[PDB]
Coordinates of C-alpha atoms and ligand atoms in Angstrom, one line a residue:
Chain O
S820 CA 80.5 123.5 78.4
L821 CA 79.3 121.4 81.5
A822 CA 77.4 124.4 83.2
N823 CA 77.4 128.1 83.6
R824 CA 78.7 128.1 87.2
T825 CA 81.8 127.0 89.2
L826 CA 81.6 123.3 90.2
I827 CA 82.2 122.8 93.9
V828 CA 84.4 119.8 94.4
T829 CA 84.5 118.0 97.9
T830 CA 87.8 116.3 98.8
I831 CA 90.0 114.9 101.6
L832 CA 93.5 115.1 102.4
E833 CA 95.2 111.5 101.7
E834 CA 98.8 111.1 100.4
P835 CA 99.5 111.0 97.2
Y836 CA 95.7 111.9 96.2
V837 CA 95.2 115.1 97.7
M838 CA 98.4 116.8 99.6
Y839 CA 98.8 120.3 100.8
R840 CA 101.3 122.0 98.6
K841 CA 104.9 123.2 99.7
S842 CA 105.4 126.8 98.8
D843 CA 107.8 129.4 100.1
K844 CA 104.9 131.9 99.9
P845 CA 101.3 131.8 100.7
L846 CA 99.0 130.1 98.2
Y847 CA 95.2 130.5 97.5
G848 CA 92.3 128.6 96.5
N849 CA 92.8 125.3 94.3
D850 CA 96.5 126.2 94.2
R851 CA 96.9 124.9 98.0
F852 CA 96.4 121.4 97.0
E853 CA 98.3 119.0 94.6
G854 CA 98.4 115.2 94.1
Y855 CA 97.0 112.4 91.7
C856 CA 93.4 113.6 92.3
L857 CA 94.3 117.1 91.7
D858 CA 95.7 116.2 88.2
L859 CA 92.8 114.0 87.5
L860 CA 90.4 116.8 88.1
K861 CA 92.7 119.1 86.2
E862 CA 92.4 116.6 83.3
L863 CA 88.5 116.2 83.8
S864 CA 88.1 119.9 83.5
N865 CA 90.2 120.2 80.5
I866 CA 88.3 117.4 78.6
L867 CA 84.7 118.4 80.0
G868 CA 85.2 122.4 80.1
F869 CA 84.5 123.1 83.7
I870 CA 86.0 125.5 86.7
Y871 CA 85.9 124.1 89.8
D872 CA 86.4 125.1 93.8
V873 CA 88.1 122.4 95.7
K874 CA 86.6 122.2 99.5
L875 CA 87.9 119.7 102.0
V876 CA 85.1 118.1 103.6
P877 CA 84.5 119.8 107.0
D878 CA 84.1 116.7 109.0
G879 CA 87.2 115.1 107.6
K880 CA 85.2 111.8 106.5
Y881 CA 84.7 109.9 103.4
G882 CA 81.3 108.4 104.0
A883 CA 79.4 106.2 106.6
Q884 CA 76.1 105.8 108.4
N885 CA 74.9 105.6 111.9
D886 CA 72.1 103.0 112.9
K887 CA 69.5 105.8 111.8
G888 CA 71.1 105.7 108.2
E889 CA 72.4 109.2 108.5
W890 CA 75.4 109.4 106.1
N891 CA 78.5 111.8 107.1
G892 CA 81.8 113.0 105.0
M893 CA 82.0 113.2 101.4
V894 CA 79.0 111.3 100.6
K895 CA 76.7 113.6 102.8
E896 CA 78.0 116.5 101.1
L897 CA 76.6 114.8 97.7
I898 CA 73.3 113.7 99.1
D899 CA 72.8 117.4 100.6
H900 CA 73.7 118.9 97.5
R901 CA 76.6 121.1 98.9
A902 CA 79.2 119.5 96.3
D903 CA 78.7 118.4 92.7
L904 CA 81.8 116.2 92.4
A905 CA 83.7 114.3 95.0
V906 CA 87.3 113.7 93.6
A907 CA 89.2 111.4 96.2
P908 CA 90.2 107.8 96.7
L909 CA 86.6 107.1 97.5
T910 CA 85.8 103.3 97.1
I911 CA 82.5 102.4 94.9
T912 CA 80.4 100.1 97.5
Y913 CA 77.0 98.7 97.4
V914 CA 75.8 100.8 100.3
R915 CA 77.2 104.3 98.8
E916 CA 75.8 103.5 95.4
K917 CA 72.4 103.2 96.7
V918 CA 73.0 107.0 97.9
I919 CA 75.1 108.6 95.5
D920 CA 76.3 108.0 92.0
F921 CA 79.9 107.3 91.2
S922 CA 81.7 107.6 87.7
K923 CA 83.2 104.1 86.6
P924 CA 86.4 103.8 88.6
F925 CA 89.6 105.7 87.8
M926 CA 91.6 103.1 89.9
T927 CA 90.9 99.2 90.4
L928 CA 92.9 97.8 93.7
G929 CA 92.1 95.2 96.6
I930 CA 93.1 93.9 99.9
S931 CA 96.6 92.6 100.1
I932 CA 99.4 92.1 102.6
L933 CA 101.9 94.6 103.6
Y934 CA 105.0 92.7 105.2
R935 CA 108.9 93.0 105.6
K936 CA 110.9 91.5 102.3
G937 CA 113.0 88.1 101.7
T938 CA 110.7 85.9 104.0
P939 CA 109.0 82.1 103.0
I940 CA 105.4 84.1 103.2
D941 CA 103.8 84.3 99.8
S942 CA 100.0 84.4 100.6
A943 CA 97.2 85.0 103.1
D944 CA 97.3 81.3 103.5
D945 CA 100.7 81.3 104.5
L946 CA 99.9 83.6 107.2
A947 CA 96.7 81.7 108.2
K948 CA 98.3 78.4 108.7
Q949 CA 101.1 79.6 111.2
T950 CA 100.9 81.8 114.5
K951 CA 104.6 83.0 114.7
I952 CA 103.7 86.1 112.5
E953 CA 101.3 88.5 113.6
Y954 CA 98.7 90.3 111.5
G955 CA 96.0 92.2 111.4
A956 CA 94.3 95.6 109.9
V957 CA 92.9 99.1 111.1
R958 CA 90.4 98.4 113.6
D959 CA 87.0 99.2 112.0
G960 CA 88.4 100.0 108.5
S961 CA 87.3 98.7 105.5
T962 CA 89.7 95.6 105.6
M963 CA 88.6 94.7 108.9
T964 CA 85.2 94.4 108.0
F965 CA 86.0 92.3 104.8
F966 CA 87.4 89.8 107.3
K967 CA 84.6 89.7 109.8
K968 CA 82.0 89.4 107.0
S969 CA 83.8 86.4 104.9
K970 CA 82.5 83.1 104.4
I971 CA 85.8 82.1 102.7
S972 CA 87.6 79.4 104.7
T973 CA 91.3 80.8 105.0
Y974 CA 89.8 84.4 105.7
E975 CA 87.2 83.2 108.3
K976 CA 90.4 81.5 110.1
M977 CA 92.3 84.8 109.5
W978 CA 89.2 86.5 111.3
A979 CA 89.3 84.2 114.1
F980 CA 93.1 85.1 114.9
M981 CA 92.4 88.7 114.2
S982 CA 89.8 88.7 116.8
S983 CA 91.1 86.6 119.3
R984 CA 94.0 89.0 120.1
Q985 CA 91.5 92.4 119.9
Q986 CA 94.9 94.7 120.8
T987 CA 97.9 92.9 119.4
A988 CA 96.5 92.0 116.0
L989 CA 94.2 94.9 115.3
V990 CA 95.6 98.5 115.4
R991 CA 94.1 101.7 116.1
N992 CA 94.9 103.6 112.7
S993 CA 97.0 103.2 109.7
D994 CA 100.0 105.2 111.2
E995 CA 100.1 102.8 113.8
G996 CA 100.0 99.8 111.5
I997 CA 102.9 101.1 109.3
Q998 CA 104.8 101.7 112.7
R999 CA 103.9 98.1 113.8
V1000 CA 105.2 96.2 110.4
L1001 CA 108.4 98.2 110.6
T1002 CA 109.0 97.4 114.7
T1003 CA 107.6 93.9 115.2
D1004 CA 107.1 90.8 113.0
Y1005 CA 103.6 91.9 111.8
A1006 CA 101.9 91.9 108.5
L1007 CA 99.2 94.3 107.6
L1008 CA 96.2 93.6 105.5
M1009 CA 95.6 96.8 103.5
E1010 CA 94.5 98.3 100.3
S1011 CA 97.0 97.4 98.0
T1012 CA 97.4 101.1 96.4
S1013 CA 98.6 102.4 99.6
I1014 CA 100.9 99.0 99.6
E1015 CA 102.5 100.2 96.5
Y1016 CA 103.1 103.6 97.6
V1017 CA 104.7 102.7 100.8
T1018 CA 106.9 99.7 99.2
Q1019 CA 108.4 102.4 96.6
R1020 CA 109.6 104.5 99.7
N1021 CA 110.6 101.6 102.1
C1022 CA 112.7 99.1 100.5
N1023 CA 112.9 96.8 103.3
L1024 CA 109.0 96.5 102.7
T1025 CA 107.1 94.5 100.1
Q1026 CA 103.6 93.2 99.0
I1027 CA 103.1 89.5 99.9
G1028 CA 101.0 87.8 97.4
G1029 CA 98.2 89.1 95.1
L1030 CA 94.6 90.7 95.8
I1031 CA 92.2 89.3 98.4
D1032 CA 89.2 91.2 96.9
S1033 CA 88.5 93.7 94.0
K1034 CA 87.3 97.3 94.3
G1035 CA 87.8 100.5 92.7
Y1036 CA 87.8 104.3 93.6
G1037 CA 85.4 106.5 91.6
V1038 CA 84.1 110.1 91.2
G1039 CA 81.3 110.7 93.4
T1040 CA 78.2 112.7 92.3
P1041 CA 74.8 113.2 93.5
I1042 CA 72.4 110.7 92.8
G1043 CA 70.8 111.7 89.3
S1044 CA 73.6 114.0 88.1
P1045 CA 74.1 114.5 84.3
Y1046 CA 77.9 114.8 85.1
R1047 CA 78.4 111.1 86.0
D1048 CA 78.3 109.7 82.7
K1049 CA 80.2 112.6 81.2
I1050 CA 83.0 111.9 83.9
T1051 CA 83.0 108.0 83.1
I1052 CA 83.4 108.9 79.1
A1053 CA 86.6 111.5 80.3
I1054 CA 88.3 108.6 82.7
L1055 CA 87.9 106.1 79.7
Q1056 CA 89.3 108.7 77.2
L1057 CA 92.3 109.2 79.9
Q1058 CA 92.6 105.3 80.4
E1059 CA 93.0 104.8 76.4
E1060 CA 95.4 108.1 76.0
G1061 CA 97.8 106.2 78.8
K1062 CA 97.3 109.2 81.2
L1063 CA 96.0 107.2 84.2
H1064 CA 98.9 105.0 83.7
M1065 CA 101.5 108.1 83.7
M1066 CA 99.6 110.0 86.5
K1067 CA 100.0 106.8 88.8
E1068 CA 103.5 106.4 87.9
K1069 CA 104.3 110.3 88.7
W1070 CA 102.9 110.0 92.1
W1071 CA 103.8 106.3 93.1
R1072 CA 107.5 106.2 92.0
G1073 CA 110.0 106.3 94.6
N1074 CA 113.8 106.7 93.5
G1075 CA 114.6 103.1 93.7
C1076 CA 115.2 99.7 95.3
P1077 CA 118.0 97.2 94.4
Chain B
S108 CA 60.3 93.3 90.4
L109 CA 62.6 94.7 88.0
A110 CA 60.6 94.1 84.6
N111 CA 57.1 93.0 84.3
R112 CA 58.7 91.5 80.7
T113 CA 61.2 88.8 79.9
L114 CA 64.5 90.6 79.0
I115 CA 66.3 89.8 75.9
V116 CA 69.6 89.0 76.6
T117 CA 72.2 89.2 73.3
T118 CA 75.1 87.2 74.2
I119 CA 78.2 85.4 72.2
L120 CA 79.9 81.9 72.3
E121 CA 83.3 82.6 74.1
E122 CA 84.7 79.9 76.5
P123 CA 84.2 79.8 79.7
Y124 CA 81.8 82.8 79.6
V125 CA 79.2 81.3 77.2
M126 CA 79.5 77.9 76.0
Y127 CA 77.0 75.2 74.4
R128 CA 76.0 72.2 77.0
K129 CA 77.0 69.0 76.1
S130 CA 74.2 66.7 76.7
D131 CA 73.5 63.5 75.1
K132 CA 69.3 64.7 75.0
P133 CA 67.7 67.8 73.2
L134 CA 68.2 71.2 75.0
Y135 CA 65.9 74.2 74.8
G136 CA 66.1 77.6 75.6
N137 CA 68.4 79.1 77.9
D138 CA 69.3 75.3 79.0
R139 CA 71.2 75.3 76.0
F140 CA 73.8 77.3 77.4
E141 CA 76.4 77.5 80.5
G142 CA 79.3 79.4 81.8
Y143 CA 80.4 82.3 83.7
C144 CA 77.8 84.4 81.9
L145 CA 74.9 82.2 82.6
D146 CA 76.0 82.1 86.2
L147 CA 75.8 85.7 86.5
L148 CA 72.6 86.0 84.7
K149 CA 71.4 83.6 87.1
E150 CA 72.6 85.9 90.1
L151 CA 71.5 88.8 88.7
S152 CA 67.8 87.8 88.2
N153 CA 68.0 86.5 91.9
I154 CA 68.8 89.8 93.3
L155 CA 66.7 91.9 90.9
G156 CA 64.0 89.4 90.0
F157 CA 63.8 89.5 86.2
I158 CA 63.0 86.9 83.6
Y159 CA 65.4 86.5 80.8
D160 CA 65.6 84.9 77.2
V161 CA 69.2 84.1 76.2
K162 CA 69.7 84.8 72.3
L163 CA 73.2 84.6 70.6
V164 CA 74.0 87.7 68.5
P165 CA 73.4 86.7 64.8
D166 CA 76.4 87.9 63.3
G167 CA 78.7 86.8 66.0
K168 CA 80.4 89.8 66.7
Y169 CA 81.2 92.0 70.0
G170 CA 80.5 95.4 68.3
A171 CA 82.7 97.8 66.2
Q172 CA 82.0 100.7 63.3
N173 CA 82.6 99.9 59.7
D174 CA 83.9 102.7 57.2
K175 CA 80.2 104.0 57.0
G176 CA 80.1 104.4 60.6
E177 CA 77.6 101.5 61.1
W178 CA 77.7 99.5 64.2
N179 CA 77.5 95.6 64.4
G180 CA 77.2 92.8 67.0
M181 CA 75.6 93.1 70.3
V182 CA 76.2 96.9 70.5
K183 CA 74.1 97.2 67.5
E184 CA 71.5 94.8 69.1
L185 CA 71.2 97.4 71.7
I186 CA 71.3 100.3 69.8
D187 CA 68.5 99.1 67.7
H188 CA 66.4 98.0 71.0
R189 CA 66.5 94.3 69.7
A190 CA 68.0 93.5 73.2
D191 CA 67.6 94.9 76.8
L192 CA 71.0 93.4 78.1
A193 CA 74.5 92.2 76.7
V194 CA 75.9 89.6 79.0
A195 CA 79.1 88.8 77.5
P196 CA 83.1 89.5 78.3
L197 CA 82.2 93.0 76.5
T198 CA 85.0 95.5 77.3
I199 CA 84.0 98.9 78.3
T200 CA 85.3 101.2 76.0
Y201 CA 85.3 105.1 75.3
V202 CA 83.9 104.4 71.8
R203 CA 81.2 102.0 72.8
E204 CA 80.1 104.4 75.8
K205 CA 79.4 107.0 73.4
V206 CA 76.4 104.7 71.8
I207 CA 75.3 102.2 74.8
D208 CA 75.6 102.5 78.4
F209 CA 77.6 99.6 80.5
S210 CA 77.3 98.6 84.3
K211 CA 80.3 99.1 86.4
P212 CA 82.4 95.7 85.4
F213 CA 81.9 92.6 86.7
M214 CA 85.5 91.5 86.0
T215 CA 88.8 93.5 85.7
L216 CA 91.7 92.7 83.6
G217 CA 94.4 93.6 81.3
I218 CA 96.8 93.1 78.4
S219 CA 99.7 90.4 79.4
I220 CA 101.9 88.0 78.0
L221 CA 101.6 84.1 77.1
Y222 CA 104.6 82.2 76.8
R223 CA 106.4 78.7 77.7
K224 CA 107.1 77.9 81.3
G225 CA 110.5 78.5 83.0
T226 CA 112.3 80.7 81.0
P227 CA 114.4 83.7 82.1
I228 CA 111.8 86.2 80.9
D229 CA 110.1 88.2 83.4
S230 CA 108.3 91.1 81.6
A231 CA 107.4 93.2 78.6
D232 CA 110.8 94.9 79.0
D233 CA 112.6 91.9 79.1
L234 CA 111.0 90.9 75.4
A235 CA 111.6 94.6 74.4
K236 CA 115.4 94.3 74.9
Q237 CA 115.9 91.3 72.5
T238 CA 115.0 90.0 69.1
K239 CA 115.6 86.1 69.6
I240 CA 112.3 85.3 71.0
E241 CA 109.5 86.5 68.8
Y242 CA 106.5 88.4 70.2
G243 CA 103.2 89.8 68.9
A244 CA 99.4 89.7 68.7
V245 CA 96.2 89.0 66.8
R246 CA 96.1 91.4 63.5
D247 CA 93.7 94.1 64.2
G248 CA 92.7 92.9 67.5
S249 CA 92.3 95.2 70.6
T250 CA 95.6 94.1 71.9
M251 CA 97.4 95.1 68.5
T252 CA 95.5 98.8 68.7
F253 CA 96.8 99.1 72.0
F254 CA 100.5 98.8 70.9
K255 CA 99.9 100.8 67.9
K256 CA 98.5 103.7 69.7
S257 CA 101.0 103.6 72.6
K258 CA 103.4 106.5 73.5
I259 CA 105.0 104.4 76.1
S260 CA 108.9 103.6 75.4
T261 CA 108.7 100.1 76.3
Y262 CA 105.5 99.4 74.2
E263 CA 106.4 102.0 71.3
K264 CA 109.7 100.0 70.8
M265 CA 107.6 96.5 70.8
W266 CA 105.1 98.1 68.1
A267 CA 108.1 99.0 66.1
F268 CA 109.3 95.3 66.6
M269 CA 105.6 93.7 65.6
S270 CA 104.9 96.1 62.9
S271 CA 108.4 95.8 61.0
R272 CA 108.0 91.9 61.7
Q273 CA 104.2 91.6 60.8
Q274 CA 104.4 88.3 58.9
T275 CA 105.4 86.5 61.9
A276 CA 104.8 88.3 65.0
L277 CA 101.1 89.6 64.0
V278 CA 99.0 86.3 63.7
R279 CA 95.5 86.1 61.9
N280 CA 93.5 84.8 64.8
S281 CA 93.6 83.5 68.5
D282 CA 94.1 79.8 67.5
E283 CA 97.0 80.7 65.3
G284 CA 98.4 82.5 68.0
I285 CA 98.2 79.7 70.5
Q286 CA 100.1 77.4 68.1
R287 CA 102.9 79.5 67.4
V288 CA 103.4 79.8 71.3
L289 CA 103.1 75.8 71.6
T290 CA 105.4 75.2 68.3
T291 CA 107.8 78.1 67.9
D292 CA 109.7 80.4 70.4
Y293 CA 107.0 83.0 70.4
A294 CA 105.2 85.1 73.1
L295 CA 101.7 86.2 72.7
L296 CA 100.3 89.2 73.9
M297 CA 96.5 88.8 75.0
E298 CA 93.7 89.0 77.6
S299 CA 94.5 88.2 80.9
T300 CA 91.5 86.6 81.9
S301 CA 92.1 84.4 78.6
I302 CA 95.8 83.8 80.0
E303 CA 94.5 82.6 83.2
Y304 CA 92.2 80.3 81.5
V305 CA 94.7 78.7 79.1
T306 CA 97.5 78.3 81.8
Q307 CA 94.9 76.4 84.2
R308 CA 94.6 74.0 81.4
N309 CA 98.4 73.7 79.5
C310 CA 101.1 73.0 82.2
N311 CA 103.6 74.1 79.5
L312 CA 102.6 77.6 79.3
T313 CA 102.6 80.6 81.8
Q314 CA 101.7 84.2 82.2
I315 CA 104.8 86.6 81.8
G316 CA 104.7 89.7 84.1
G317 CA 101.6 91.5 85.2
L318 CA 99.0 93.7 83.4
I319 CA 100.2 96.2 80.8
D320 CA 97.1 98.3 80.6
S321 CA 93.6 98.0 82.8
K322 CA 89.9 97.4 81.2
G323 CA 86.9 95.8 82.5
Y324 CA 84.0 93.7 81.2
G325 CA 80.6 95.1 81.8
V326 CA 76.8 94.4 81.0
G327 CA 75.7 96.3 78.0
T328 CA 72.4 98.2 77.7
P329 CA 70.5 100.6 75.4
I330 CA 71.5 104.3 76.5
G331 CA 69.2 105.3 79.4
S332 CA 68.2 101.6 80.6
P333 CA 66.7 101.9 84.2
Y334 CA 68.4 98.5 84.3
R335 CA 72.0 99.6 84.1
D336 CA 72.1 101.0 87.6
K337 CA 70.3 98.3 89.0
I338 CA 72.7 95.8 87.5
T339 CA 75.8 97.8 88.7
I340 CA 74.2 97.5 92.2
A341 CA 73.6 93.8 92.0
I342 CA 77.4 93.4 90.7
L343 CA 78.6 95.1 93.8
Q344 CA 76.5 93.2 96.1
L345 CA 77.9 89.8 94.2
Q346 CA 81.5 91.0 94.8
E347 CA 80.8 91.8 98.4
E348 CA 79.1 88.4 98.9
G349 CA 82.4 86.8 97.4
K350 CA 80.1 85.3 94.7
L351 CA 82.0 86.8 91.8
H352 CA 85.0 85.3 93.2
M353 CA 83.6 81.8 93.7
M354 CA 82.1 82.2 90.2
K355 CA 85.6 83.1 88.5
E356 CA 87.0 80.0 90.6
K357 CA 84.3 77.7 89.5
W358 CA 85.0 78.2 85.7
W359 CA 88.8 79.0 85.6
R360 CA 90.2 76.7 88.0
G361 CA 92.2 73.7 86.5
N362 CA 93.3 70.5 88.1
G363 CA 97.1 71.7 88.6
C364 CA 100.4 71.4 87.6
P365 CA 103.7 69.6 89.1
Ligands
LIG1746 O1 86.7 105.1 100.5 C1 87.2 104.7 101.2 O2 86.5 104.6 102.6 C2 88.6 104.5 101.1 C3 89.3 105.8 101.9 C4 90.8 105.9 101.8 C5 91.3 104.5 102.9 C6 92.7 104.5 103.0 O3 92.9 103.3 103.5 C7 94.2 103.2 103.6 C8 95.0 104.7 103.4 C9 96.4 104.4 103.8 C10 96.7 103.4 104.5 C11 96.0 102.3 104.8 CL1 97.1 101.2 105.5 C12 94.8 102.2 104.4 C13 94.0 101.2 105.0 N1 92.6 101.5 105.6 N2 92.4 100.2 105.6 N3 92.9 99.3 104.8 N4 94.0 99.9 104.5 C14 93.1 104.0 101.3 C15 92.7 104.9 100.5 C16 91.2 105.4 100.6 C17 90.3 104.5 99.9 N5 89.2 104.7 99.8
LIG1747 O1 84.5 93.8 74.0 C1 85.5 92.8 73.0 O2 85.6 93.5 71.9 C2 86.2 92.0 73.7 C3 85.9 90.6 72.9 C4 86.4 89.5 73.5 C5 88.0 89.2 73.2 C6 88.7 88.1 73.6 O3 90.0 88.3 73.7 C7 90.3 87.0 73.5 C8 90.0 86.0 74.3 C9 90.1 84.8 74.5 C10 91.7 84.6 73.8 C11 92.2 85.7 73.0 CL1 93.9 85.3 72.5 C12 91.5 87.0 73.1 C13 92.6 88.0 72.6 N1 93.2 89.0 73.1 N2 93.8 89.7 72.1 N3 93.4 89.5 71.1 N4 92.8 88.1 71.3 C14 88.6 88.1 75.1 C15 86.9 88.2 75.6 C16 86.4 89.3 75.1 C17 87.0 90.5 75.4 N5 86.1 91.7 74.9

């Protein structure tokens, strides 16, 4: 008992949160998808008693604004009441929190470093004080913005290096970034959850140091939605039951690295 | 801008969040206190424009239910509308969220291990595998409850160890637990924020492994308070500005180790 009607869930394809399910025969509706977020959605529907319809965000975007303030992506779907929930790795940010509501986080993470295994680099500071190893982030991504705006000595220094080499230092997309780490002596600054995913599948790669910032993913709802607080309670129940840990293990685990 | 009235803030003495100021001259009102949470209040009032009056919770408790299902501590002060905000390291929990509201976390942490430096022990699994090194937690503490309830094989084994060896493994209080780590061959399971604090000030001690669970501290409010969402937004602003990082450094950092 949450509402007498199917809830519309906006989402986006992103491994391993929301993925297209491999099948030998055609699949329909929600059955077409799988992943951490689909498991979270099933768990939330079990606890809260709702039926749902998963719809990919038409423009394939998470949510940002133009200079006139027009939002796009999942955030816009919620603002316009075209979706009841957004279940995706959607970062809880100051700007978004002003236009939509978020449950409390289901996952906490931060910016960290993706690099090769067995080198003497152990931190952002180590990278900052040298020039032989290149480093950067996805151009105009969440990680790039963090460095551009930072007033922290080491991060301001890193940004100076990342913006001297517009082209060599920054990457066009995340695919290019991972390819660059694998093919050149390059360290990629990126979301720690994605680092964990990649390092479980590439034994030659490792995370360097800890978290550079702190952020979390939350279920998005339109502003004022009564479902927001019920989803927060369900997330807390899942955490205390150990189910958030089991869901992360399920999707993140690789078959092993020596 | 936020409220016409001076907000009543319930809090509790807990180093380095809320402490009594050491002065040689009498201190009055809010000037009697200092700490991470007093700095957080200053920053939140600077953003939101409210005035506040800090009051230590009479019973000196965070908030739990007794046998009659009656709440105590800061939680009870909020329930009864004797406080507008609770600004303290108050864990966001499923039970509390049922009776009060919380801002999104201003600090994330988890259970971890405090032990002596330079040993071969590197994780909970290393401790679980043996019996020579005793390990445990504060009796009926948050940390003990986690182990008692866990379905994770490693932690279920650790609970079996703790419950069977209760007289030595389970400690009466935090002080007793820290003395055990210092005087005996004992590892203490406890909140990671408190481990960081202790290890910055005692070079003989270290944190073992990473985080065993995930939890956050939030600003508590009575259910329905309009200040809750404003607080959440101010917390997001402070993190993005790097002020939460600066505040954590200010109060946690020690003078170093060899
Ligand atoms: O709310 C948001 O905008 C993001 C959208 C989305 C962004 C995804 O970004 C990556 C995804 C995979 C691999 C990498 Cl290498 C990155 C990355 N990008 N910037 N820094 N690292 C991370 C997961 C999601 C987290 N919420
Ligand atoms: O909302 C709550 O009830 C708690 C209450 C309070 C608990 C404090 O816990 C410790 C603090 C310092 C040292 C230690 Cl050793 C402990 C601890 N860890 N496990 N058992 N005891 C941490 C601060 C607050 C965290 N929120």
